[PDB]
């Protein structure tokens, strides 16, 4: 037994309780974890920390986020070289970033990114990967029929 929510021909499906947008399924989670613990939790559901490729994708997810919290995305720079990599292995596209003003601003250590609300706006902030925050898991949708 499994249970899907399918929307359109072809039908795009997600697990019943996940949020659906353009062939992908998302779930924001609010219990605090480090970046690596967060990714561990996502992968346990077949998922990964969310990759954000378009503004449309970000605009979709932010409507389900608590403005008091930071949410880990999948983007990580392990040695502070500016070698940002998506943990889901989507190739990093530096012409499609969404930093807050004056970010990224950590010049040392292992840095990760959170979606955070600041200055009346959702955008990216770089944060030490050992910081504890919420997260957004993302899993590719399935297709029928
Ligand atoms: Ca920062």
Swiss-Prot record:
<feature type="binding site">
    <location>
        <position position="105"/>
    </location>
    <ligand>
        <name>Ca(2+)</name>
    </ligand>
</feature>
<feature type="binding site">
    <location>
        <position position="125"/>
    </location>
    <ligand>
        <name>Ca(2+)</name>
    </ligand>
</feature>
<keyword id="KW-1064">Adaptive immunity</keyword>
<dbReference type="GO" id="GO:0035579">
    <property type="term" value="C:specific granule membrane"/>
</dbReference>
<feature type="disulfide bond">
    <location>
        <begin position="14"/>
        <end position="25"/>
    </location>
</feature>
<keyword id="KW-0399">Innate immunity</keyword>
<dbReference type="GO" id="GO:0034987">
    <property type="term" value="F:immunoglobulin receptor binding"/>
</dbReference>
<dbReference type="GO" id="GO:0038187">
    <property type="term" value="F:pattern recognition receptor activity"/>
</dbReference>
<keyword id="KW-1015">Disulfide bond</keyword>
<dbReference type="GO" id="GO:0030246">
    <property type="term" value="F:carbohydrate binding"/>
</dbReference>
<dbReference type="GO" id="GO:0046872">
    <property type="term" value="F:metal ion binding"/>
</dbReference>
<feature type="binding site">
    <location>
        <position position="103"/>
    </location>
    <ligand>
        <name>Ca(2+)</name>
    </ligand>
</feature>
<feature type="disulfide bond">
    <location>
        <begin position="42"/>
        <end position="137"/>
    </location>
</feature>
<keyword id="KW-0472">Membrane</keyword>
<dbReference type="GO" id="GO:0005537">
    <property type="term" value="F:D-mannose binding"/>
</dbReference>
<feature type="binding site">
    <location>
        <position position="126"/>
    </location>
    <ligand>
        <name>Ca(2+)</name>
    </ligand>
</feature>
<dbReference type="GO" id="GO:0005886">
    <property type="term" value="C:plasma membrane"/>
</dbReference>
<feature type="glycosylation site" description="N-linked (GlcNAc...) asparagine">
    <location>
        <position position="32"/>
    </location>
</feature>
<comment type="subunit">
    <text>Heterodimer with CLEC4E; disulfide-linked. CLEC4E acts as a bridge for interaction between CLEC4D and FCER1G to form a functional complex. Heterodimer with CLEC6A; this heterodimer forms a pattern recognition receptor (PRR) against fungal infection.</text>
</comment>
<dbReference type="GO" id="GO:0070821">
    <property type="term" value="C:tertiary granule membrane"/>
</dbReference>
<keyword id="KW-0812">Transmembrane</keyword>
<keyword id="KW-0479">Metal-binding</keyword>
<protein>
    <recommendedName>
        <fullName>C-type lectin domain family 4 member D</fullName>
    </recommendedName>
</protein>
<dbReference type="GO" id="GO:0061760">
    <property type="term" value="P:antifungal innate immune response"/>
</dbReference>
<dbReference type="GO" id="GO:0038094">
    <property type="term" value="P:Fc-gamma receptor signaling pathway"/>
</dbReference>
<feature type="disulfide bond">
    <location>
        <begin position="112"/>
        <end position="129"/>
    </location>
</feature>
<keyword id="KW-1003">Cell membrane</keyword>
<keyword id="KW-0325">Glycoprotein</keyword>
<dbReference type="GO" id="GO:0042742">
    <property type="term" value="P:defense response to bacterium"/>
</dbReference>
<keyword id="KW-0430">Lectin</keyword>
<feature type="topological domain" description="Extracellular">
    <location>
        <begin position="1"/>
        <end position="145"/>
    </location>
</feature>
<feature type="glycosylation site" description="N-linked (GlcNAc...) asparagine">
    <location>
        <position position="41"/>
    </location>
</feature>
<keyword id="KW-0106">Calcium</keyword>
<dbReference type="GO" id="GO:0101003">
    <property type="term" value="C:ficolin-1-rich granule membrane"/>
</dbReference>
<dbReference type="GO" id="GO:0043123">
    <property type="term" value="P:positive regulation of canonical NF-kappaB signal transduction"/>
</dbReference>
<dbReference type="GO" id="GO:0002250">
    <property type="term" value="P:adaptive immune response"/>
</dbReference>
<dbReference type="GO" id="GO:0002292">
    <property type="term" value="P:T cell differentiation involved in immune response"/>
</dbReference>
<dbReference type="GO" id="GO:0009897">
    <property type="term" value="C:external side of plasma membrane"/>
</dbReference>
<comment type="function">
    <text>Calcium-dependent lectin that acts as a pattern recognition receptor (PRR) of the innate immune system: recognizes damage-associated molecular patterns (DAMPs) of pathogen-associated molecular patterns (PAMPs) of bacteria and fungi. The PAMPs include alpha-mannans on C.albicans hypheas and mycobacterial trehalose 6,6'-dimycolate (TDM). Interacts with signaling adapter Fc receptor gamma chain/FCER1G, likely via CLEC4E, to form a functional complex in myeloid cells.</text>
</comment>
<feature type="domain" description="C-type lectin">
    <location>
        <begin position="21"/>
        <end position="138"/>
    </location>
</feature>
<dbReference type="GO" id="GO:0030887">
    <property type="term" value="P:positive regulation of myeloid dendritic cell activation"/>
</dbReference>
<keyword id="KW-1133">Transmembrane helix</keyword>
């Amino acid at each position: 037994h499994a249970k899907l929510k399918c929307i359109k021909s072809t039908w795009n499906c997600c697990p019943i309780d996940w949020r659906a947008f353009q062939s992908n399924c998302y779930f924001p989670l609010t219990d605090n974890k480090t970046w690596a613990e967060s990714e561990r939790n996502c992968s346990g559901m077949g998922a990964h920390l969310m990759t954000i490729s378009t503004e449309a994708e970000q605009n979709f997810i932010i409507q389900f986020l608590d403005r008091r919290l930071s949410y880990f995305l999948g983007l990580r720079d392990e040695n502070a070289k500016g070698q940002w990599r998506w943990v889901d292995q989507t190739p990093f596209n530096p012409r499609r970033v969404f930093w807050h003003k004056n970010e990224p601003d950590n010049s040392q250590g292992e840095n990760c990114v959170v979606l955070v609300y600041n200055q009346d706006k959702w955008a990216w902030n770089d944060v030490p990967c050992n910081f504890e925050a919420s997260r957004i898991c993302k899993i590719p949708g399935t297709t029928l029929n």
